[PDB]
Amino acid sequence: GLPWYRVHTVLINDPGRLIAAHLMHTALVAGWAGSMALYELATFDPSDPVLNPMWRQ
Amino acid sequence: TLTYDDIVGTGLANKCPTLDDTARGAYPIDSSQTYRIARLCLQPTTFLVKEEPKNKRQEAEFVPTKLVTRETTSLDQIQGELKVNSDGSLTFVEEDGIDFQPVTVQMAGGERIPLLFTVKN
Ligand code: CLA
Ligand code: CLA
Ligand code: CLA
Ligand code: CLA
Ligand code: CLA
Ligand SMILES: CCCCCCCCCCCCCCCC(=O)OC[C@H](COP(=O)(O)OC[C@@H](O)CO)OC(=O)CCCCCCCCCCCCCCC
Ligand SMILES: CCCCCCCS[C@@H]1O[C@H](CO)[C@@H](O)[C@H](O)[C@H]1O
């Protein structure tokens, strides 16, 4: 069988499933962006742009 | 002029009576006579709250807030004596009325500030 480090090679000859895998990847990345923003908003203190700006937090 | 059923649910019941643009006259005070305020109404249109900076060296500002307790804010049906003093100044002395309203406003960022909006005594 395919060794573990080669499992994704089943997509080489399969354009449709490659698009599917790419779509899943894109979904994970956009989901991360959304999650990260929400986590940041849950933690961010907006009360002092002078001495406690975003980059200190 | 207007009845309860004309007014109910509109928001007008939280508003004070207004006067015409033409009402710019003068009401004479006779120092021989005693006076009263038969009705005093107060309708808040803005609630501002002073910012409390960590840097107690900057000049702190009063900032706009968002009202969350709806049209429940006005003081009304307030009465008391209107004394005429020696120097001809008038002194209103609040005696009774709907002279307080609990009010909650919200700062930018969501912090709620309850207050007893009042003119008691
Ligand atoms: C666009 C980027 C990209 C894409 C689409 C691919 C795609 C592919 N790679 Mg290449 N490769 C890349 C970049 C990429 N690679 C980089 C940056 C390196 C150096 C690190 C390599 C080094 C490399 C080697 C040595 C091999 C491949 C192989 C393969 C093929 C099979 C992969 C597989 O089944 O893994 C299966 C993987 C797993 C089951 C688990 C991997 C777990 C990793 C190590 C840790 C977790 C990572 C985490 C989940 C993702 C983090 C995201 C990150 C970008 C921030 C496939 C064509 C194989 C091949 O050529 O087959 C014939 C192969 O031997 N790649
Ligand atoms: C972008 C991510 C991505 C995508 C689109 C694919 C897509 C594909 N994979 Mg690959 N894989 C991935 C990442 C991905 N994989 C990673 C990170 C690993 C190492 C675990 C693998 C290991 C792997 C194997 C062994 C196989 C595939 C296979 C396949 C195919 C069928 C689906 C499958 O069997 O998945 C299996 C993989 C998973 C179900 C991913 C594991 C889920 C991990 C643990 C993340 C858990 C998410 C969770 C919600 C977060 C945890 C939070 C934590 C803080 C508690 C398809 C082409 C199959 C294939 O066709 O072989 C020929 C197959 O046998 N993958
Ligand atoms: C007018 C024709 C056209 C258009 C507009 C595109 C556009 C795109 N292609 Mg390409 N492609 C084309 C022709 C076209 N292609 C042809 C003729 C082939 C040979 C079959 C390919 C082969 C190909 C492959 C193998 C892949 C792409 C991928 C992509 C996407 C990469 C960027 C992305 O995912 O952003 C992020 C997405 C968005 C911001 C959302 C965009 C909104 C979409 C377009 C609306 C979806 C509804 C629509 C009616 C259905 C799909 C339309 C389709 C023509 C793209 C992008 C949407 C990649 C992809 O799909 O990755 C996920 C990919 O793997 N294309
Ligand atoms: C330009 C930006 C970019 C590029 C080129 C890639 C490219 C890739 N991504 Mg994606 N990713 C990105 C941004 C990007 N990512 C962002 C912003 C997020 C949100 C955080 C993700 C989330 C994400 C997930 C969840 C997964 C990928 C995976 C993949 C791989 C899929 C192809 C494959 O089979 O590789 C085969 C694998 C390799 C060639 C190994 C990659 C080696 C990386 C670069 C270093 C890993 C470091 C270390 C060993 C492990 C980390 C420690 C651990 C505790 C997490 C490929 C390397 C999938 C994957 O790796 O499947 C196996 C996968 O599951 N990505
Ligand atoms: C649908 C449209 C769309 C829009 C309007 C946005 C908007 C935004 N995103 Mg989101 N995102 C989207 C889709 C979108 N995204 C998709 C489909 C994914 C999954 C891949 C993501 C994943 C994502 C992540 C992980 C992040 C964002 C972030 C952001 C913000 C900053 C953008 C930035 O810095 O870009 C930077 C973009 C570039 C520098 C473009 C690079 C272009 C390269 C160089 C092109 C190279 C190839 C090209 C073909 C070369 C030829 C060019 C030719 C003209 C000559 C912004 C609010 C950030 C954020 O703030 O999250 C909350 C952030 O971290 N997005
Ligand atoms: C964010 C989500 C994250 C997802 C989690 C991802 C999980 C994937 C983890 C990958 C684990 C890979 C391990 C494969 C391990 C493995 O299968 O090895 C053996 C393997 C042999 O492959 P073959 O081609 O012979 O095929 C046999 C097949 O059955 C394998 O599938 O070779 C490799 O994979 C190359 C990598 C070398 C690695 C060898 C290092 C071992 C040395 C020991 C190091 C410690 C000693 C140090 C002392 C100083
Ligand atoms: C999917 C996004 C929906 C989540 C929206 C959350 C409301 S918005 C949220 O409100 C808080 C209190 O006012 C603020 O402290 C915080 O900065 C703000 O992000």
Side-chain angles (χ1 to χ4, degrees), chain B residues 1 12 14 20 26 37-38 41 56 69 86 93 116 120:
Chain B
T1 170
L12 291 168
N14 195 43
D20 290 48
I37 285 178
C41 183
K56 296 189 180 182
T69 47
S86 305
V93 175
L116 198 74
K120 281 184 177 305

Side-chain angles (χ1 to χ4, degrees), chain A residues 19-36:
Chain A
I19 291 154
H22 285 175
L23 278 160
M24 188 56 62
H25 183 267
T26 311
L28 286 159
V29 180
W32 174 87
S35 303
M36 197 71 255

Side-chain angles (χ1 to χ4, degrees), chain A residues 11-53:
Chain A
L11 306 172
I12 289 167
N13 206 223
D14 195 331
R17 290 199 165 174
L18 180 76
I19 291 154
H22 285 175
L23 278 160
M24 188 56 62
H25 183 267
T26 311
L28 286 159
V29 180
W32 174 87
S35 303
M36 197 71 255
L38 293 166
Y39 178 84
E40 285 188 10
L41 285 165
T43 57
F44 181 63
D45 169 23
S47 68
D48 187 15
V50 178
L51 295 189
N52 198 202

Side-chain angles (χ1 to χ4, degrees), chain B residues 11-119:
Chain B
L12 291 168
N14 195 43
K15 298 189 195 309
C16 294
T18 65
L19 294 177
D20 290 48
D21 287 339
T22 54
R24 313 286 181 179
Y27 181 75
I29 302 300
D30 197 72
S31 57
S32 306
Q33 208 160 2
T34 54
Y35 292 89
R36 276 185 72 88
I37 285 178
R39 181 182 171 185
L40 173 68
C41 183
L42 287 90
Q43 174 199 331
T45 61
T46 314
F47 293 96
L48 302 139
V49 172
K50 190 190 274 178
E51 282 189 318
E52 294 172 6
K54 323 174 300 191
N55 189 66
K56 296 189 180 182
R57 225 179 311 112
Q58 73 170 77
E59 224 294 288
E61 306 266 65
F62 282 96
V63 292
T65 60
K66 207 128 65 166
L67 170 69
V68 295
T69 47
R70 308 174 79 187
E71 294 295 333
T72 55
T73 58
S74 291
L75 314 184
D76 202 358
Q77 299 177 58
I78 294 159
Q79 62 173 245
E81 65 165 319
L82 186 68
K83 270 186 273 184
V84 196
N85 312 306
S86 305
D87 61 347
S89 72
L90 309 168
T91 297
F92 172 63
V93 175
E94 195 259 353
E95 193 172 309
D96 200 9
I98 310 164
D99 61 1
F100 69 98
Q101 288 304 344
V103 177
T104 306
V105 294
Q106 210 168 281
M107 322 248 40
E111 190 184 347
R112 289 155 177 186
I113 313 292
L115 71 136
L116 198 74
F117 172 51
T118 191
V119 289

